[PDB]
Amino acid sequence: KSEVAHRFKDLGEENFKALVLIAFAQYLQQCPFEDHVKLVNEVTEFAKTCVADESAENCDKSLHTLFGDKLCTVATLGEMADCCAKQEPERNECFLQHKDDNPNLPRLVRPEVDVMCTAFHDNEETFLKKYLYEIARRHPYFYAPELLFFAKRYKAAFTECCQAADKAACLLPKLDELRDEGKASSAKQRLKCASLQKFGERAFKAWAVARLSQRFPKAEFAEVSKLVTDLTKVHTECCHGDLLECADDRADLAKYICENQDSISSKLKECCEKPLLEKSHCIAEVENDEMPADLPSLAADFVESKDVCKNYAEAKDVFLGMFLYEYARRHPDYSVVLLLRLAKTYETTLEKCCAAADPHECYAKVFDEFKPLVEEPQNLIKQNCELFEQLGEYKFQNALLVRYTKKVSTPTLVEVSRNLGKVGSKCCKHPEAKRMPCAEDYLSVVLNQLCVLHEKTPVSDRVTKCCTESLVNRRPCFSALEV
C-alpha cells in the first residue's frame, strides 16, 4: 500500500501538486517560491513512480514521514530547524505548533494590471501557482480545498478581465473581493482548528450538529450525526496538516451527500450538477432547507417523558445531540452559539435534576430558563442595528472604536472596529429572522481573530480571559466588559 499513490490517483496530478504546494507553503512560510516549486516537483515525480508501482522504494512510507523528510531536508540546509531534528510523530506535532498565524509578513504588493495580465498569458501555470503560494504562506490555517476553489475564481477573473477594455476596472475589484472573502474564510478555518486543536471534537461536533440541523431540518438525527462525523474527519485532517487526505475526504463527502439528497435536503440539486470543487463549495454555502410541516414541541420528549434522566444517563452526548438537533432544526433564526448556550443550560439542569429524588419536578420548567438567554442577543442586535441606521457605517465604526478602546494596540482596534461596522452594514440590512445567524456567527470570527492577535503578544489580561474562558461565551464575556 502506497498512500501517496492512492492520493495521487484520487486527487489527480493537478490537484495533488497544488495541495502539496499549499502544504509546504503553510509550513515553510519564509521560503522562496522557487524552493517550494522544486520540492513539489520532486515529490510529484516520486509519487508517479509509486503510481506506476506501489512496491517502488519508499512508496509505502506515510505521508507525514515523506513530507517531513522533504521539508526537513531543506531545513538542515531558527526554531523550524529544531522540528527537523525530531522523529515522526513528534516532528509533525512540532511543525504544527510552529505554524504561526502572523509572524509578520509584508503585505502583498500587486504588480500593475498590464504586467499581471501579460504574466498570466506567458505562463498561466506558474502565475497561478505563485498566487497559491502567496495566499497559503500568509494564511497557514486556510482550508486547503477552499483555496483550490479561490484559485479557480482568480483564474476566471484574469481570463475575463485581461481581455477587457479597462483591465483594472474589471480585475482590481474582483481581486479585492477575493482577498476579502479569503481573509474571512481563513478566519473561520482558524476558529474551527482552534476548537479541534485544543478541546477536541466535542466542541466542533456540537457546533456541527447545530449548524447542519438548521441547514438540513428534514434529515433524520442519524443522518445529521453521520454528516457531522464525516465533516469532523475532513476538518481534523486539514487542521493537522493532512492536506491530501482532507481534500479526498471532502470530495468523498460531497459525493455521499449528492447520492443521498432525498435523505438530506431538497436544495442540493444545483450543486450536485457542478464540477467537483465547485459542488463541495456550493454544498457548503447551500441555504437552509424548509423545515418539516407540523413539528411537535420538544416538551414531550425533553421535559414530560419519564425516560429523560434514563436517556440522559445512558448516553449523555447522544441525548444532548438529539436535543440540539431538535431545537436547531426548528430554529434557523438562532445563532449557532445561542443554540449551544441552550444545550449547555439543558445539560447543567439535567446534571443537577437527575440527581434529585423527583427529577421531573426539578427540570419541569427548564424551557423558561431559555427565554432570558434568547432575548439578550436579540435585544443587542436590535439596539445596535437601530444605532447603525441612525449613524451610518463610518460614525457607527467610530462609536464602536471609542466603546471598545474605553473598555480595553490602536491599529488592531481600528481594523476590528471597521470590520464590526461592516457587520452592521451587512447584517442589519437583513430581515429580523436572519439577523442573528449572520451577526453572531461573523462576530465570533472577528473576536477569534482579535484573540489570536492578542495571543501572539499577550500585553492584556481581560481579553485572554474572555478568549480562553468559553468559546460559546466569548462574545457575552467580551461584550459585557466594563471601562
- 220 touching other proteins, by CB under 8 A: yes
Provide the mask over 290-319, with x wherever binding to other proteins is found by CB under 8 A and - wherever it is not.
-------------------------x-xx-
* Comparison of 98 and 202: residue with beta carbon closer to other proteins: 202
- Give residues 258-287 in contact with other proteins (rule: CB under 8 A): 259-263
Q: Please, which residue, 89 or 200, has the CB nearer to other proteins?
A: 200
Q: Give the chain's largest Cα–Cα span.
A: 79
**Nearest CB to other proteins, comparing residues 265 and 419:** 265
293: helix, coil or strand? Answer: coil
Distance, in Å, from the CA atom of 211 to the CA atom of 254, rounded to the nearest integer, reads: 17
Between 246 and 416, whose beta carbon lies closer to other proteins?
246
Q: How far is the CB of 208 from other proteins (least distance, A)?
A: 10
Q: For other proteins, which stretch binds (CB under 8 A), given 102-110, 124-132, 253-261, 443-451?
A: 253-261
- The nearer residue to other proteins, 315 or 480, going by C-beta atoms, is 315
Among 99, 155, 226, 267, binds other proteins (CB under 8 A): 226
Stretch that binds other proteins, among 33-41, 225-233, 337-345, 437-445 (CB under 8 A): 225-233
Binding residues for other proteins, total number by CB under 8 A: 17
Q: Which of the stretches 148-156, 247-255, 256-264, 286-294 binds other proteins when contact is defined by CB under 8 A?
A: 256-264
Calculate the alpha carbon distances from 377 to 339, 381, 390 in Å: 12, 6, 20
Smallest distance from other proteins to CB 317, Å: 5
Q: At what angle do helices 316-330 and 201-215 cross, to 10 degrees?
A: 30
CA distance linking residue 201 with residue 234, whole number of Å: 12
- Fill in the amino acid letter for 53: D
Q: Which window, 29-37, 78-86, 226-234, 445-453, contacts other proteins (CB under 8 A)?
A: 226-234
Are the C-beta atoms of 475 and 444 separated by less than 8 Å? yes
Buried b vs exposed e over 274-287: b needs ≥16 C-beta within 10 Å? eebbebbbbbbebe
Report the distance separating Cα 76 and Cα 434, nearest Å. 53
At closest approach, how far in Å is the CB of 277 from other proteins? 23
Q: Which three cell numbers stand for residue 451?
A: 484573540
Residues 147 and 92 sit within 8 Å (Cβ to Cβ): no
Which CB atom, from 269 or from 365, has the smaller least distance to other proteins? 269
User: In the stretch 182-201, what mask flags binding to other proteins with x, by CB under 8 A?
Assistant: --------------------
Distance in Å, CB of 220 to other proteins, minimum: 8
Q: Which is nearer to other proteins, 13 or 290 (CB)?
A: 290
Give yes or no for a contact between 3 and 62, defined as CB atoms under 8 angstroms apart.
yes
DSSP 391-440: H-HHHHHHHHHHHHHHH--HHHHHHHHHHHHHHHHHHTTS-HHHHHHHHH
240 is in an annotated binding site: yes
Taking the complex as a whole, the smallest distance from the CB of residue 141 to other proteins amounts, in Å, to 24
CB 286 within 8 A of CB 267: yes
d(CA 478, CA 472): 11
368 class by beta-carbon count within 10 Å (0-12 exposed, 13-18 middle, 19+ buried)? exposed
Q: Which of 128, 166, 170 has its CA nearest to residue 150? A: 128
Residue among 316 and 434 whose Cβ is closer to other proteins: 316
End-to-end Cα separation, the chain, in angstroms: 61
- In the complex with other proteins, which residue's Cβ is closer, 261 or 345? 261
Nearest approach, Cβ of residue 5 and other proteins (Å):
21
- Alpha helices (H) along 143-262: 144-161, 167-198, 201-215, 221-239, 243-259
What residue numbers does the annotated binding site for Ca(2+) cover? Answer: 3, 10, 237, 242, 245, 248, 252
What residue numbers does the annotated binding site for Zn(2+) cover? Answer: 64, 240, 242
What residue numbers does the annotated binding site for (4Z,15Z)-bilirubin IXalpha cover? Answer: 233
The binding site for other proteins (CB under 8 A) comprises 202, 205, 220, 222, 225-226, 228-229, 259-263, 315, 317-318, 321
